[PDB]
Amino acid sequence: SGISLDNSYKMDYPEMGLCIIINNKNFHKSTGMTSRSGTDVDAANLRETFRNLKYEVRNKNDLTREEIVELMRDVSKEDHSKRSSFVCVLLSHGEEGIIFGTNGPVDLKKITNFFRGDRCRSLTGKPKLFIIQACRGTELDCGIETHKIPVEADFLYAYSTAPGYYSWRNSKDGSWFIQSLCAMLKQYADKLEFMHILTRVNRKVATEFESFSFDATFHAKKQIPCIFSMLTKELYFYHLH
């Protein structure tokens, strides 16, 4: 045949892949963690958004740290041979490097390690996307007026907020990041490469949202998401044929 290029992931396997959504709303009283009003709006928006991208969505609600680890392990031991990609969305409390189960923390490294190139062979060379709506610390952004591959290759972490910062969730509308992510996927997934979609998400969150609080410490604050890409190819959710 004619000349060929391979700068984009093959996304025309029989299946797009799994989209695992972990939606932690209610936490064990002993943890002291508040209930995450608005997160069901996020989980429903994500389910519909990834459904329309032809992902096999599995929604899970209010999982303990043990259940999160068991779920991830089990999913990583499935045969993904016929799947183009893998998506995991985490909606919870967090801090830097950590996501909360309903009864305590989970190391993000533990979750993602199950999908390493050497540990989930049917996803080797395929994009593994982790979308994380959770705090990463307690900083607030005041704004300003205007023949081997690496085992960590082919991961993408779409973080809702900059390292060290809180992340903002609206109890009525959902989180700023997930709201914006689903809107940009709906508008551009048939048009733009994924990093360019996520850059539009960055701009939407940065420009269209600002917190409102009766507490001056938490009022008029801003947010920028953080794209953490170790992908080796361009990622389009569509394919040609």
């Binding site: 508040t34 995450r36 009003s37 608005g38 919870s92 409390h93 967090g94 709506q133 959770a134 705090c135 809702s160 809180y166 992340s167 903002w168 969730r169 609206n170 109890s171 989180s175 917190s211 409102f212 609080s213 938490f218």
Partner: peptide, 4 residues
């Protein structure tokens, strides 16, 4: 608006 609430923080996560």
């Amino acid at each position: 608006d609430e923080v996560d």
